[PDB]
Amino acid sequence: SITDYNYKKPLHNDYQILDKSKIFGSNSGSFVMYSMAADAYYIYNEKESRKRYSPNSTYKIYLAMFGLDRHIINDENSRMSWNHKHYPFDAWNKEQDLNTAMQNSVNWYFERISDQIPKNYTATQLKQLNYGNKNLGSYKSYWMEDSLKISNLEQVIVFKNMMEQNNHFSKKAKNQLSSSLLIKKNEKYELYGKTGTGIVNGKYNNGWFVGYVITNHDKYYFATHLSDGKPSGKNAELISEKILKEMGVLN
Amino acid sequence: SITDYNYKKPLHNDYQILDKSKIFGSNSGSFVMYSMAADAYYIYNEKESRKRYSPNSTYKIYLAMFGLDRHIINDENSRMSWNHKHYPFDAWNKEQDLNTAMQNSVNWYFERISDQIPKNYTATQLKQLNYGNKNLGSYKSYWMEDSLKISNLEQVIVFKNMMEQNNHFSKKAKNQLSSSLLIKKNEKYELYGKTGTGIVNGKYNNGWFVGYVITNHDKYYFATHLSDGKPSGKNAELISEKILKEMGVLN
Numbered sequence: 001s002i003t004d005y006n007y008k009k010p011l012h013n014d015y016q017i018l019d020k021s022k023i024f025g026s027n028s029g030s031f032v033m034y035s036m037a038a039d040a041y042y043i044y045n046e047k048e049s050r051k052r053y054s055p056n057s058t059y060k061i062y063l064a065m066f067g068l069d070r071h072i073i074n075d076e077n078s079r080m081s082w083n084h085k086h087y088p089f090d091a092w093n094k095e096q097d098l099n100t101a102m103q104n105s106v107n108w109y110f111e112r113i114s115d116q117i118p119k120n121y122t123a124t125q126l127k128q129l130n131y132g133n134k135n136l137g138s139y140k141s142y143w144m145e146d147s148l149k150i151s152n153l154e155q156v157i158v159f160k161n162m163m164e165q166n167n168h169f170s171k172k173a174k175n176q177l178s179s180s181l182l183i184k185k186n187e188k189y190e191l192y193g194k195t196g197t198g199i200v201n202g203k204y205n206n207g208w209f210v211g212y213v214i215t216n217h218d219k220y221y222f223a224t225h226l227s228d229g230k231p232s233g234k235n236a237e238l239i240s241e242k243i244l245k246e247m248g249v250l251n
Numbered sequence: 252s253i254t255d256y257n258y259k260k261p262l263h264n265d266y267q268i269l270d271k272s273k274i275f276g277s278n279s280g281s282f283v284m285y286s287m288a289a290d291a292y293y294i295y296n297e298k299e300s301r302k303r304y305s306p307n308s309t310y311k312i313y314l315a316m317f318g319l320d321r322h323i324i325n326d327e328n329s330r331m332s333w334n335h336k337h338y339p340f341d342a343w344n345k346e347q348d349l350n351t352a353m354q355n356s357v358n359w360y361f362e363r364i365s366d367q368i369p370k371n372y373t374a375t376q377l378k379q380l381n382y383g384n385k386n387l388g389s390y391k392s393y394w395m396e397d398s399l400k401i402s403n404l405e406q407v408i409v410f411k412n413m414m415e416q417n418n419h420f421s422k423k424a425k426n427q428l429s430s431s432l433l434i435k436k437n438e439k440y441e442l443y444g445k446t447g448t449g450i451v452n453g454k455y456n457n458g459w460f461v462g463y464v465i466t467n468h469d470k471y472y473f474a475t476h477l478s479d480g481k482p483s484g485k486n487a488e489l490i491s492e493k494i495l496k497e498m499g500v501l502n
């Protein structure tokens with residue numbers, strides 16, 4: 001418990017320390033990036049990057065994966081009916097498929113998936129995935145400012161590993177997941193990712209943007225965590241991109 | 252044969268006649284576009300648009316569809332080994348999957364698919380799809396400046412129908428095909444398409460760009476054919492986009 005807020009495991013890869021404090025501006029947090037080609041990490045604010053926070057809606061990545069893996073949703077049909085309950089966001093108040101669910105961060109879609117998953121499966125997956133503190137707690141919205149916590153550095157390690165390694169997870173699962181995460185594509189690059197936002201007492205307190213970039217030459221996994229300032233998922237995306245552009249990943 | 256060079260069937264939809272001769276410049280051809288929402292067509296140079304030409308590499312769209320439909324390739328694996336024969340283009344001289352095959356217009360990939368398809372299946376599909384003159388001839392590269400011919404107007408009608416109508420083609424087939432055709436994506440739109448280029452006596456003679464656009468509000472099917480000037484698939488793409496941008500489809 002006293003070491004379950006911190007990822008202490010030393011890196012067995014080359015790594016560089018960046019200074020993107022100018023881009024982060026009045027916001028506080030960290031940025032991590034992995035380069036498939038260099039098998040190397042690029043970290044800004046490694047202290048913050050090793051502190052564990054709740055994953056918020058970035059966990060939807062893994063919930064989506066579990067749902068595909070247990071045939072809750074599939075490639076032929078991932079649709080779910082709206083229950084006719086009003087939600088704060090209009091995009092939630094309609095039928096969803098994985099793509100629309102993921103793109104609009106429709107909580108109830110993944111909640112409905114979460115309810116059909118046994119706890120021992122979830123716990124087995126987190127173990128094998130090395131997902132943060134691996135702490136399910138009461139097993140009720142555990143990924144939402146609750147027991148489960150992961151570090152910015154681990155977000156990149158766990159995601160890259162799950163996607164790139166020969167897991168029990170199928171290639172078509174990974175591709176379907178990957179489809180649901182595609183944000184931008186042009187001649188130069190494909191950008192994939194997922195935002196996370198936390199709100200406490202009407203104040204943003206926890207902002208994620210986790211994803212990856214495919215170029216012609218390389219492939220990159222990355223994540224931005226915001227802890228103070230204006231720590232929203234959107235602000236995490238904006239910062240991620242201007243860092244990726246200024247580092248010449250998006251050109 | 253005397254009516255097999257022309258699509259004469261009258262339109263049972265609204266349609267408008269455009270003037271994009273300025274964009275076409277010193278190139279000659281036509282542009283067709285369909286709007287799901289308006290159930291209406293937008294044609295420039297309807298004469299040219301009704302004349303049938305060989306589909307070149309736009310036929311790869313349908314070959315890809317057939318290969319998925321006959322489990323020649325799958326969502327799990329669509330890879331094919333290179334035979335270690337040199338090809339004029341370097342991107343051809345390696346392993347391919349559907350995406351790389353389609354993106355680089357790797358002829359041999361789809362030829363290898365074509366060879367495993369019965370003729371009566373092909374002929375059945377063209378019948379049900381209303382693909383052009385439906386003429387297979389000797390059934391050997393019939394889609395390459397040979398017997399099979401389709402009009403710019405039909406490219407849009409046949410593609411839209413195959414994709415949008417509940418035929419025997421599965422949703423996952425269509426999505427996998429759709430994935431292989433994605434070119435550009437941003438906040439505003441997803442652009443999908445396939446180029447075609449013909450070369451005779453070292454001169455471009457036949458240029459295609461067939462595809463569709465998904466926006467927030469609408470969905471559009473489109474095609475550009477170039478018959479004279481500099482009629483290359485790439486030039487057909489450039490013209491398609493300038494027309495789509497200037498019509499405010501890519502905004």
Ligand SMILES: *[C@@H](O)[C@@H](NC(=O)/C(=N\OC)c1csc(N)n1)[C@@H]1N=C(C(=O)O)[C@H](C[N+]2(C)CCCC2)CS1
Nearest residue numbers: 056057105107144145195196197198199200233234
């Ligand atoms: C995942 O982060 C989701 N977030 C929430 O449900 C929470 N607050 O959102 C207001 C939350 C969970 S526990 C807690 N204390 N707060 C959804 N995802 C995001 C996201 O960043 O993708 C949302 C924010 N967006 C989508 C709203 C408009 C732009 C960003 C909120 S819902």
Ligand SMILES: *[C@@H](O)[C@@H](NC(=O)/C(=N\OC)c1csc(N)n1)[C@@H]1N=C(C(=O)O)[C@H](C[N+]2(C)CCCC2)CS1
Nearest residue numbers: 307308356395396446447448449450451483484485
């Ligand atoms: C499909 O159009 C393919 N084209 C060809 O094989 C032919 N010529 O290519 C030079 C061809 C077939 S019959 C005939 N008389 N000529 C491939 N697709 C394209 C394409 O546009 O996707 C290629 C052309 N590009 C990529 C290079 C220059 C313009 C675009 C050629 S191979």
